[PDB]
């Protein structure tokens, strides 16, 4: 967990250096990329417009060249988001629009620390999409570790822009 949190902070610290207006335009573009997976599949091949087009305008210069100091953090965020389902993606943007990322990030970090190896609750939804047995319930199944670690990165990186 400590090595995972350090791997997250090495990118979260470098995304705090992005501008306030650029963080809002990046957040607006990613919330738009949510609704349309047509933008998600084009990252591996990668001017354009739209949700990913707005994100593209955030990470290019006057000549359109990529900024590796800013493209790599976005590549790492998309790499942690691909391990999650579209239901988890849409619930993450629900937490984005509600601007209450402190609660779920705190709970995921507290769980992730303990695990060294209910119905109608988004966290439970979130945990049901992860693959846990819901009903305290400290019982942890390792089959969902990677998605929860990717969820933690999908949470902390957004808090770095909050």
């Amino acid at each position: 967990f400590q090595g995972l949190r350090a791997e997250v902070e090495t990118i979260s610290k470098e995304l705090e250096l992005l501008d306030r207006e650029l963080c809002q335009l990046l957040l607006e573009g990613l919330e738009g990329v949510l609704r349309d997976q047509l933008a998600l599949r084009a990252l591996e091949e990668a001017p354009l417009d739209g949700p990913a087009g707005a994100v593209l305008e955030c990470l290019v210069l006057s000549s359109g060249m990529l900024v590796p100091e800013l493209a790599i953090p976005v590549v790492y965020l998309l790499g942690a988001l691909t391990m999650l389902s579209e239901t988890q993606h849409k619930l993450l943007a629900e937490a984005l629009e509600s601007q209450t990322l402190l609660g779920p990030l705190e709970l995921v970090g507290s769980l992730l620390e303990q695990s060294a190896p209910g119905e109608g609750a988004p966290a439970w939804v979130l945990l049901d999409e992860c693959g846990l047995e819901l009903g305290p319930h400290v019982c942890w199944e390792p089959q969902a570790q990677g998605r929860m670690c990717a969820l933690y990165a999908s949470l902390a990186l957004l808090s770095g822009l909050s």
Binding site: E16, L17, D19, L25, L70
Partner: protein, 173 residues
């Protein structure tokens, strides 16, 4: 190379800007002193390789400005404080008109790091300590004389760059 000031402009400035500029001792009877402290090797911090180039450059520059340059390398916070108080007590400043203090090491916002500095074992010299050493109370030979403190120590771990709408072979101190 370091360009020199012609004799005309030096004297004209001394005539027409007497009360606005700091006085100068006679070149014949002057003893300008400067001090350089530079920590390059550490036990828990990456090495500051290449600082030797900065040491010789500053030393040669200050020598061109007619300064006797003292050099200290790789010291602890106690040794750095002791070296500073020893430099402040040297009597040649009575025959001097100014001084330079070139500090080069890792640092934080509070001050400059020593050789054996760590987050758990902090070995740091505060910037306020320097001004305390060279103020008019502890150093009386440099009263009413310029005191130039040129430091190179990063003061935070955050980069100092942003991004606004419209080489790479260097280490970080």
């Amino acid at each position: 190379a370091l360009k020199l000031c012609p004799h005309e402009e030096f004297l004209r400035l001394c005539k027409e800007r007497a009360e606005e500029i700091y006085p100068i001792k006679e070149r014949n009877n002057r003893t300008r002193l400067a001090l350089i402290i530079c920590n390059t090797e550490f036990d828990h911090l990456p090495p500051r390789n290449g600082a030797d180039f900065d040491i010789t450059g500053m030393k040669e520059l200050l020598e061109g400005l007619d300064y006797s340059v003292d050099v200290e390398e790789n010291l602890t916070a106690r040794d750095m404080e002791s070296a500073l108080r020893a430099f402040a007590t040297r009597p040649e400043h009575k025959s001097s008109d100014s001084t330079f203090l070139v500090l080069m090491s890792h640092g934080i916002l509070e001050g400059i790091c020593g050789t054996v500095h760590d987050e758990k074992k902090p070995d740091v010299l505060l910037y306020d300590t320097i001004f305390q050493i060279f103020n008019n109370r502890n150093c009386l030979s440099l009263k009413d004389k310029p005191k130039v403190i040129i430091v190179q120590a990063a003061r935070g771990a955050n980069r100092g760059e942003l991004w606004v709408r419209d080489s790479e072979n260097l280490e970080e101190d």
